[model samples]
Target chain A: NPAKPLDGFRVLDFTQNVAGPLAGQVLVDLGAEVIKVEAPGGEAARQITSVLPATYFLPNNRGKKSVTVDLTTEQAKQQMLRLADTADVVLEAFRPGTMEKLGLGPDDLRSRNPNLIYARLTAYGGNGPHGSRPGIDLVVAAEAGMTTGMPTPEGKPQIIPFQLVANASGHVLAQAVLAALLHRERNGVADVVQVAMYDVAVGLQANQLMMHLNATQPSDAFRTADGYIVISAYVPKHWQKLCYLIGRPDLVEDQRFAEQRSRSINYAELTAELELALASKTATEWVQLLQANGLMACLAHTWKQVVDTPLFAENDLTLEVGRGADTITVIRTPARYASFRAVVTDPPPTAGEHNAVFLAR
Target chain B: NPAKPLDGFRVLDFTQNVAGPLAGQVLVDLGAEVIKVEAPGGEAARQITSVLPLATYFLPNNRGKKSVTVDLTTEQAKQQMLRLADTADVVLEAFRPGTMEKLGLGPDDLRSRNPNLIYARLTAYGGNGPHGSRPGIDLVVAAEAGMTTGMPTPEGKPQIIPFQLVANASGHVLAQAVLAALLHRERNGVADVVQVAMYDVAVGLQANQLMMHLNRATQPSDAFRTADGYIVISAYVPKHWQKLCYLIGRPDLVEDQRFAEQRSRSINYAELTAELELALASKTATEWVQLLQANGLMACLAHTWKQVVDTPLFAENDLTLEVGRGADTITVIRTPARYASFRAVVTDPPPTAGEHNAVFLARP
Candidate 1:
């Protein structure tokens, strides 16, 4: 009757902070019994509450039990190895040497649990020049060219507003873990999965950088009269529709903007002219007219608008999770397993909240 | 010996255009035998060339494949169904509701032959309201609130860049298909999988947007100018050497002007801050990053793909794939797949012009 894909699996999660904890949380959501092991002090994510009152910690670390163990202590370290001996998977996000120094790296842990699928999440690969260097999602984003892709109104490069590096790389790491687990389950082989945030950020940049590689100009976002909108008239039909939507059908027939190749050459002027035409209408008005005319356009909305959107709520994409003293609506990780419903059966755990129960066991 | 986890699997790829072809390409890179079923006239992607004589079509598609014919005509349609019958996995990216009727929808064609997996792709889910009718990446970005989140600089709301939608969603869809395949393979059962573009985009947005559900204040990029150049900083620490190097270190620095909080750092920032001050001492941004790292600050080379492809990081990370492209350096999809060299091979075959002869014979 279990609906999760990993209903019978056990996971020993030794990850801290957002990247690793989020990966473990994803496994938990997919129906794995995730045991979160923390150091004596607590996980770094425990302190990330000022942004949304445990919002950052709660959303990704929910539905998992927490246990505290000073890995530096012999007894506690042995207890972790014993736990791994019976676990199907073990995940850690410590700096490259921290795990080995503590005598609990993948090779050591896997010796205790041969079937263990060990997942190591880092900002960079373990043996790389930057491997020993510390990094968070923000650092990886900046390091990776994500910050460079953001272009301002004047066409100068700007920084990206959101923490896309963390979100993307974390989700990717989680997905990689699940994939590796599936591989192990099927092939009867223990696999070591290492996910680097820097690589994920760069891979995500492949498409954005493609045009730049070919020296082709990319489509630009423009400010409409009421709000901002972006147009991707990559094809001639789309270009014609955009022209017609802005009430400039004459430009659609203009030879200079006829093909995608030509549009690339005249993108700046075309975008400027389109913005001038769109400036006459409100964002709402433009949305109606442009959409009706089969043009690709949208009103640039704030984060509030994104949350309140009916499309999001109607699809059951957002879930309300209870954190300390309050319940906030969170965007559920997007890995829907059809056979089993991925539900949030537990709230995010308090720091070392499950120490007594787990340690006693 | 095939090192990839999906070495033995075979895929019947009926995807056309960017989104679908890109998804199949990911599978191909992972060592799946993806047989691309093109129409007699070739896929539209073959026509999409950048002045690069080779049509630039195979850059995303035609990787790890054998291309063969299954014309949409009655005779070819029957053969196409036969091809799907033998393949372990089948994928296509048609607009909603049209695929199922094209005799390409449903498990009926492949169920009897493979009885394992069936994957379908669509721009939108059929059941979704108005937005489902549209095609192409930008429309979905607009309708799904991607535009709002993608806004670039000068402090305006985020606008959706059309490029990210197609590419990002394509990768997500490919990952979903692979996950589904793995699950199906493990359970010894069959699953008909469908991933709508809008849902993928929404799932992507939720990653970061969930944090700001309360404050509703827009997040902006934070860049600091060093004396030498500009360096982007994401997280700052107390012993943040840049602050110390700039001579702005205060014991009671938890409540300083620019170093107060994430929100404060995001806004009310001027040019001559601590980061800029430290940067001035160095000759280049790279030199400053080296010093910043020595001081325990997380910094890296803010480089484009061109520069990244040539960096020591690539060499140190061992993330290169020597794909066979003659003169052109064709590499596998650059992902962080760190496994022992013995377990799985890093690079798989990228499809040549037309390599589907044997696969076509196995079909019917």
Candidate 2:
């Protein structure tokens, strides 16, 4: 058998929400033994499945075992710490001061096992002016200027379209944990890794922040007659292609839009002209013609279209996982290693679903 | 002195575009010596300066040393390989299969010097299939169904926001490279590093994709107008305070509207409820943010670059750096790291104008 990098590692997870749990899921996929510690009443995400059981829980909580413990009880807390002593990593998503109060903070747990890697996931830094403030994925997006990046058709700033803050932060935490684990393995130094959703979202906006700080011109998505498309006329060749694709080849030679700088200055006018030309054909026809001419144009797809699209299914990007009573279809995460097989082994575990077998035994 | 993990490490970077350069930038930030290897005529990004002098170029390409030379020429090509042989790591960002043929491919270079570390950043898989056809960032985002995750408004199906893709893809590539490098160091073995932008971005969207796939419920942004201005409500508790403050202004409102818990607020939020009424009416948004924050409410300045630069003259998070003709100010990234000294050194260099320096030296 080949060497699996993290084959024997065990992770004691106390993360409740998406960011921390998703990080654990990635570790589980990488061959770590992730044991989720949930409250006696079960995790909050379990209730989310009341309406859609397989859909809600299957994405982030899959591939991990679960154990229930009443941390509020002295015996349960002690048992949890003992579980930590046996694990290589401990992860938590509670607010800054919440974990310490519960006797599970990094300091307390690491004191019990000095070589433990403690990973904390939060909305902000553990200690800062904004440390204790309430933050959700949406609000973080707003605060990070991610929401403002998308403006309405009427030109006012609008909310961001996706749950990017949660996802980006999860990936960052996963990387931090993996990096700290490698660091410990190499240097004999234990790591206390903490990642905040706010910071990760801001980092994701690194380029946008640079462009905005430098007062660079803003780009917008426009609606064609048949569908919507994003035009990157920042490059002169792209602008030329845009002109030719719209059947107004004369516009490509026009002095008003010949240079990138001038075209950027008069982008609104140029966009209107392109829109007029785009109105001449249907969206599908436009996409076919534009792509044929080496232009970067695409139709904005809906979620249903995305899952049903042959291109995605043919690539084996989507998978079918069996939940308790139903089978849920999900997009398999895109981490493919040549040496290791990446597959969805089981459905996302139900809240505290493994407690009877894994913990009580 | 406190230890910088990658202190003495050196990287020979041939990454021309954002995905490749951004990865190099992260390594440089963690205290690695990054040397950018340029083509004889320089890369396309060298000439593409946005509003500020190469501000666009400097954003991803800065924070490292730079050496320019044409690799097509026999002597310069040999020199490039020699530089790669000397470094601890090499990163190349050409399209799939393009880098390998240039004599700069990972297998060719790593084979000669087994210890020569390399990461090939490509759009798709190196082996085969739809990897070569995808046009770097756009194609991956499209294939991953990212554009469908974002909607135009709270009530709309998710629409694709353009700017997020580059950042999302680049950040993943950077993290993966760091992981691979650290893995190599720990195991003391040479591995041909392969990373695809599409796969990383797809995995990065695990949380959102899962939520949407599982719940079948559309996630909406809960932005309400304060007494004085609009603020986004993050935590569940303050959402009630926002409603209570609004009701205090109109006592008849509490009973009439559905001002309940986080779940309730998410379900029955009324557009006319005017939760922002009290907060917006009190003072400016800054004053309200402070007051609400003082009361343990969750809030932050919905700041744009214009707003961030103007209000926070010397906030704890400000990381200022000097770029351009030495007069202009470029703010270093504000991360959560509590470093004692400088948060980041300038990894960006000013755009080089063709082979002007080489031509000048040759004439002399």
Candidate 3:
């Protein structure tokens, strides 16, 4: 029998949006008994039923029990405190002081259960100049230079289509929680972990933010007979092979494309030549031929094409949950463990779906 | 007086490049004493000294990790490594699939010696797959995973998204895997062997996009051009759409069927972008950002790298730092996680190759 990493742990998830709920979902996948505590009509994402096939709530809330509580009531507050007392972790993603004002903050809950790990996820963190600034993933990305990193040739910044910062923060928050849990298990001291979305955006760019090849790199996707294909032949061996493969062996010796420094300095010309030769084959043809020849190349697959890749199925990156029209394919956590399985046993729970389990009559 | 979470844990990092080194760095940040085992000349990235003032490629990811050279080609070095692995709480690597096994330092060899050791590996693809043997470069993985599927130019040509997203994401995933394995070992007396793939990471990052079946080629919300510069606006919801329309002085569009709802806005995305951009031309990007945000819509100026650093947002959040070795100084983005009970930042300078050999290895 295999083990679930967070088997005996109970998490009280007082989180709603992408980052917080995704953190809770990571815990769920790791086998925590996570109880999502929703407000009266459920969290804002749950109300977002407009996006038909998938909503903000659905992707992140799989396999979690849900309970609705109106925390404004004194009785509801006591009930939450009781749940926290018996829980291993309490996760919240409110503005710094929002939970404290409700008298359900770390100090409030940790006093009741000294063994509880309290994790706080915020856009700007607990205290700082911009701590109170309102932000979601986009604003943080824009401010932290993630958006800046992706610019058009004309120099206008573009959006990264996914919740990059928020999602990374989610993974960070979960990592922090897991570390805290391990700390408590060994040290008999419960720890409070904090993850800021802004910090995460900066952290993710740890490599390029310090130094990058953007100035020398070509941004062009080479034109093929049918479409575009991306190829990286920067290494001397690959560059030489690429030139010969494209019937431009003469250019391999040309001063402009001879050395790394020269090629970078004349990247635009190098791209022009590559594209000229690439136009001889379709993107599919080029990718297959180039990869087979030990060169790095791949077609820029659309979302549909991405799902259709045999690699997608081979890796088991996704699994279908639910049945008939209710069935939806969701991405699994990106790692696989030989000793533990990612537990995505059930579909996302509905709002207040498990009210009778935790709430008192 | 406070405690680091992993105070007593030791990590033997036999990995090079982004994903594996960054994972080791995360463990180092969390208070593990991580010893990086470099090859004879040094890891490939250690040779990437092209960008110094700071060894920018190597420094950020290798910060706080102790470097000890290990030439597996030598039997003596392999024996020393096995001894070190016995004392290590975790051993992380990113070699090609059979490379570790050939060196007799794969998960099985180490775990048999120390049943409680967590063995984690990072790869372009997991050990067995159609693409398992392929080398994992960030851009190549990005292309194969569809992250670079569609970046439209003004003339509708697709450009590649150039960030090393897959590399970065895999680091986070591997860290998560190590921590989980650590917790499992502590509780159940069993350590886990884990594998994180770059392709898996790239696809996982596209969770919502893949699940919602949204093609980036036709995705509506984007950075719209303003009078002075571009600003990213994500006014997708009904309330946000209405607010955006009013702020842009085209409140009539709030009632216009072709642009009113999320669905309609998606269907006529071209028309919507034109109408919004036309109105946005009246104000500079900075001006519109304030107005739209004031109206409670999510928006920000599409800042360039210079503007991004110059902005007070990072400084305000205490997310920036200055790290140096000798006369060379570089600005760094600090580790994101903070602990109320412990200091999260480790100011140890990046190590020279095998700098800690005297501490770990036996002399010939």
Candidate 4:
């Protein structure tokens, strides 16, 4: 505990909303002293589209102290300059040119503080044709080619209902900052690090994007008597086991479904036959029966099922923290270390929560 | 440039398939010496489901790694890994619980030879409880993670996406684990073994969705079915909702008693959906996105992968990579990070089985 990986690091976080806060949250969890500097009105996240009284801020802002200062004002700039002298890293999430406009650009601060790392997290890089365009998670997902692929099997190729691209950008931002920190940790020099959410959208598809061929063919899912189950099979053993479990061992020898390539050509006809076989039992009955034979099968779980389950609580994947008088259950950051596990030792600070520590100097 | 964070670090990657190889891919991108240990016949990934002669799976996952193959069934493989562990910063495997132990490369066995080695285990399930013994493929865990629900057919059946969501997420997490562990070693004298399960990564993927369920909110969508296509209304903000009401000429819905609080907005989601898009049967999502964004509401037009690929954003970010030459070539997306000073690594040629035998197995 005394030798925390980032124990001596100091981070000045000038960011808000999910992508930026999520990056700062990772630093906070890693045992850095993160002073989350916000404007007098706090962050734009407080105005997000959530119905919870406390908002979606806590899950991303836990364990970090908060300070209130309007950087655009003259007096506030001097106060921030004084604070910058005492920090090792300064992180900002403003759109391009806004930082330089306030005379608080990375070069300006790093010139004075030679050992400081200036990290700028943006929706787009500073000089692209689309650089000035405004975007959020969903927009980047679309622009990055992640959303362009297959329509879901269930309906018309509608926009994906999930936030896959938006959420992964936070991790991409964290990874970039950490690698930069590692460089600085080895030497006493600092560098500017930039992470774009659009870039992350592309990287999120790393595994499947290599080949022009679709990664998973026969994109099939069948409704069982009780619910839905997806069968992802590739190996001959996999195909054999699934057929035997579904009481259709004879079809395992069928010529149309024999070869891996052939299955794709007859994908629909094969899936229809499997769906008929799956109709004999509930999804649960079939999943357990299929999994027992080393075949891949899964039943769809709802949000209620995941949150209400005891396994997550056992794993400490979710924890309740008290931010002032209100307590909330938050999903813990997934990446963990052995001697240095990421934690939320303190609840998320209220807006300007630690003003006495930061502003009252 | 000389001080690339992981410049000289060596990794012994004994993982196959997407999740495990992707983690090793991240390490390689950060400038590590990842010696992918394949079998004499190569790992299962090289034979993956592919129409391409050489499976593209090996291209994206194994880029930047020097490769050496040893049939693990023999003692020669064990001795070679023992030598590599003496110089390795980390060793990662994606096999079942007891597979590595039998091969004499388990944490206890390897740590005795080199006490500083950080042995990471990437598993389908962790080493506990009822589901611990389950085999984890990416798609199976996606269903277990509740990703398939809410995506439904118009007839009410749930839809399943074939993308390897849980697998890729676990890969992201595995990279995080290795980086954190490496940092721990720099400060401390020893390393601790790390383990990340796909199931755990699956739960973390649902962070926002779980928070949404906890929030007092409105509907996920209200499709305005235009003649050409559909546009979704995303007026979750109170001010945006008011401005939206004025634009759509539904000024009465703004101060309506039924839709006062955002929490109460959920009570009228169905009725309001019918009210908001009643007349705009003419605009496509692309047409509506500009207008909605001009008014400053967060709306995304569903774009095809082609549109996404053709955007200036892809070229600006330098997302694509063309590895190898002539008859053997594959283009993959580059890893996400863009360093300020260090020249990004244009990946090396994909290694064939035991291609680096002279380099890796020369016996230090």
Candidate 5:
């Protein structure tokens, strides 16, 4: 009964896997009619795990019509052009020159549909020394300096298993695409919406880059007795409270941690003292106690607890969309609007299950 | 003239640090007029690094925002805020639960005065959650959201990232949420009060990882040591793995039974990694990346901050912007969204305390 803002708009999502599909998925959620054009063999992501149907494809795609076509042929390219003529946006995520090689790039498509919200997503920027260099999620993580942020005692940077670069770029792409759409509506003109993963990685480190440029006040995770917890004591009040909450009031007067600057300078020793105290308590006990005292602390949850946390369901962060063998556990969009929902209504298609509706009809 | 989509919209921002300011910054980049309400002492973040300018922490996120001061405890202040809200299309606040309502400037208060307002609340956790009313530190959210555990470190390691990813990520998510709400209102003639929590953002980040888990699969990705340094690699496809094999000069291993397919490689991941590391030690991280990537593989060196900033790659992409000069020189990474209307660089410096008091709090 309420307004879904992009209700009449159409999007031709010529993307696969996380970043590009995610950019289009947000549009699909905002009430735009989106038809995802996939390879006849399907996206590489769905087959990465060697499963009949991997679950990786579902979270980034929901509530979109699916069409599978091999875009290498003239007929297939013409089908995309037909869709583009009436589409408000066309999103692509192949390598830097793939679209141009196919003769379906911005110059070609935008000329055909001048109002097109033509967006391109790439692992790196369009052209440079590394332009032709290949990058997967982990590769971007390394190349973009995200891996420089944290390291183990051995000085080898720890690779976060999660794909921060790809997903963050996806979010940025969505923002850029929306801006392009609004620009078109407001001024009767359009611009290319460009997002690259490596650039997104740099943006994600806004605060960290500032710290790196300025450089200090360093902190790290500490080992509690049963599990790990991240305790942020950047300020004096937090440091004082944390000392007491961990029942180490003596550290409040201790030489190393008595002053905030000294506490940061001697963070290694302070961590040792905190670790001595934390060694007695579980992460949960310390988190609750410190959080109650107006200090920053949290239990570092294992993925098992994270998946099953009652808090997830309470916040509507997860949902069950289907039943039986077709069951899938989906992560809902992170924000909640009191009045509206770009809710997911269907599961991911089996490659081109809707080809009849798309190619035939 | 460029197309600033939000040219006429006014944004009233009561958020102080990264999440709130970053949200308003996006709107500023898109051509919205942003009035950032500050406390008397200014944002605590400006002092976090112990510098008077604190331009390092402040400039990257707070630029292009007009700073105004209002001590919300007073009736005059409340009335001023209400007038501003009446003139605003969006209002963003990042206090813990009930802080705005306690100041008599909550969602209900503002929307009652303006029916067409989009009010957004950025919290550590949404209502009715166990973490409600709790402080939302970046590390805390990162921990609760399954980030700390999967760090490349051994368990109990990785206390901090060089940057506060959880906090910055919240900013991006909040921006997207606000934009979506605006689009919805534009289409439907209805504006909704919205909430985006850092905890939600952190969890949502693990979408692919969670999907991997739901498929009953374990992903064994790691950073390997090369003769010169470290390089991180991904192998989810048999083709990449096969190419990696021949690229490593291990054509024989392509015939190995345990390393034949993706499923087998994943199952034999430990041995596979050991074998890969042995082969990697012959080449430098850079050399290996060049050689393997020449064959179309996904391999990379874990670049130091110096390597990243000093690279012509950064310059070619317009990735970093430098502001000011002399002792106060500050360098910032541009937000990744490139558009014709929006400039990613900070056009204005951080505001002095109460810089716009005369303008907003002028007499009737």
Candidate 6:
């Protein structure tokens, strides 16, 4: 069926861990037949958060067929070649020359299958000054300035705890792969797409990095009676409405909070004033009132509070697949298309589950 | 001429500010002829960071695009835009809901005219939602999605994890949505209407945390304190853990019963962190990073923006570009996507308001 855009596309995935595996998962979500090719005993992430099917690996590798192949063996090499001959895309995340040494580089594979879109991701690009260095999510984050200004209890520096760098790289690699596939489909010519986590991190940080050159540089969550609520009412109209709504109409004419820039410059005073005014109500009460007036505000929600919100349910982003204890909920891609759905209902495969199917001669 | 995937495609970009224009920029990078249509005095972001030709806010998202200034307030401009849309393969906009429809250039209007146009809409919230019509900026949207709730300042108040995380994610989502639509159109001859919400993309980017929340599990990974600064180390598995123990010259940690395996290490992670920090206190963060990485372990010092630009990261990766007009130049990071067939280079500087009006207004 042509229900999904990539319904019939075959992706030979030779990657693991966050960025690469997540890229493969995106294709799988869009109905690509992604074969997760790994070494014997499965990939490293299988034991990352557990003894068997690592919890860390479960979400990232969903809806993909898992197969084991000892790439060093002659049989394994032949099997990979056979799979590559039939694959529309070959996705790999290794050191610069690791694949070339294995006789499975883009040149090696694409020579046999001339129209194969070879997509490769590395920590740094292949030809850069620091190209040969090993990189993971944290390593790239540190080297790329993503750790700057991050808050820590010890008051030192901290990396952005989330896999932001890895996530960015994953989406970026997927975008490139899709573009390459489109190119091949249109022009009948193969393409080699390259992605560097370092480059992607820096590119996504374009606003901050540019600020570093020019050296220029928020609205904040304020305190309600019961707790905190995030607010961004500084855009004149909203500010005026907020002041009037909170019974602080006098502050509207006050010079300190008159404009966006001045309010920011005097944010400490502004916060004190707003917090005082907000003392009349709780976070929820204030949020309801603020939102009623069309102000941009929400409770400073924890993950628990975030889960309780109607955003996911209303948007249909939450999905459940599998059965019994393995019946787990997963977040679907947010891209909603009127023509076709972008949801994958298959469960992640166990280790070497498809070894007999994909690796057999 | 067929060097790029979208070589012959035309994108009529009516979006201003980060996400929407960034989508246009991505298409332009892939070889689309993107004409940025804006109202008089150009888009609101033209004076965001500075007051003149281009702001830092505009440069990164508006590069490699043509500018056509048109005041949509008049019937003539609306007709002109419809003509452009008829010839466009993609029409992208990020206005509030019902805003585009009021202008007579929304999806229904244009899709009726050009049935094959890839129509993309990005909003703070989706077109249908509880808070659909509410105003949404990047920071506020991120705040609503719990993206800015975890990080705390020195005073223990919640601080937004700096950088436009929502905007960046939304921009990429919009671009990928357009690509997916293009692929669908080419394959099945269906020009789908694609939509992305900043709130949704922000939540999607927090998939790791959300997965943890869903699975009721946690992982021990953060910046451990070093002598002078902080460094992040990943030594979860036995292979890396044993190597880490030896590299820090604390062989007893390997022998310790409580720190023997993943389960035990995880159970007493705080103790493990303390002991490791004690050993790491002897060397600087940078020093430990060099030492850990040399021994097949993963580590890096938490670097600041000053340290980042001062180093050779950008120069080595070929990530930075200086786009300018005459004497004024601004440094911006190049678009990250790289294709072997064609380089994603910045062919033109960020466009000035109505710079290509004459070229675009004269229709076929």
Question: Which candidate leads the pack in DockQ?
Answer: 5
- Residue A106 lDDT (model 1): 81
Model 6 lDDT tens row, B72-103:
97999999999888899998889888888999
Per-residue accuracy of model 3 over B270-291 as CA lDDT, tens digit each: 8988988899999998899888
Give the Cα-based TM-score of candidate 5 against the true structure.
Answer: 0.93
Ranking by DockQ: 5, 6, 3, 4, 1, 2
lDDT of 5 by residue, A20-123 (tens): 87777777777788888888887767675445545557777777788888777888888777777888888888888888988888899989988888888888
Model 4, docking class: acceptable
Model 1 earns a TM-score of: 0.86
Whole-model lDDT values for every prediction: 0.61, 0.58, 0.79, 0.72, 0.75, 0.80
Q: What lDDT score is found at residue A359 in candidate 2?
A: 59
Candidate 1 structure lDDT: 0.61
After superposing candidate 4, which stretches have Cα over 4 Å from the reference? A47-55, A143-162, A206-220, A323-325, B52-54, B154-156, B211-224, B232-235, B238-267, B282-284, B292-298, B326-328
Docking class of 6: medium
* Clashing residue pairs, backbone N/CA/C < 3 A, model 5: A220-B159, A220-B160, A221-B159
Q: What is the lDDT of residue A335 in candidate 1?
A: 47
Model 2 lDDT per residue over A198-287, tens place: 666656666556655552121344556766664444566666667766789987777776666766788778767767777877777876
Candidate 1 chain B weakest ten by summed lDDT: B214-223
Per-model TM-score, in order, reads 0.86, 0.82, 0.92, 0.91, 0.93, 0.94
**Per-residue lDDT for B264 in model 6?**
79
Q: Which candidate leads the pack in lDDT?
A: 6
Clash count list over all predictions: 15, 27, 0, 4, 3, 0
- All DockQ scores: 0.40, 0.29, 0.51, 0.47, 0.60, 0.58
Better of 1 and 6 by lDDT: 6
Model 3, A5-27: lDDT tens digits are 89989999999878999889889
lDDT tens readout by residue for model 6, A251-305: 8998887765577678788889989999999988998998888888887666666
**Candidate 1 interface RMSD (Å):** 4.0
lDDT over C-alpha atoms for residue B197 of model 5 = 88
Alpha carbon lDDT at B156, candidate 5: 39
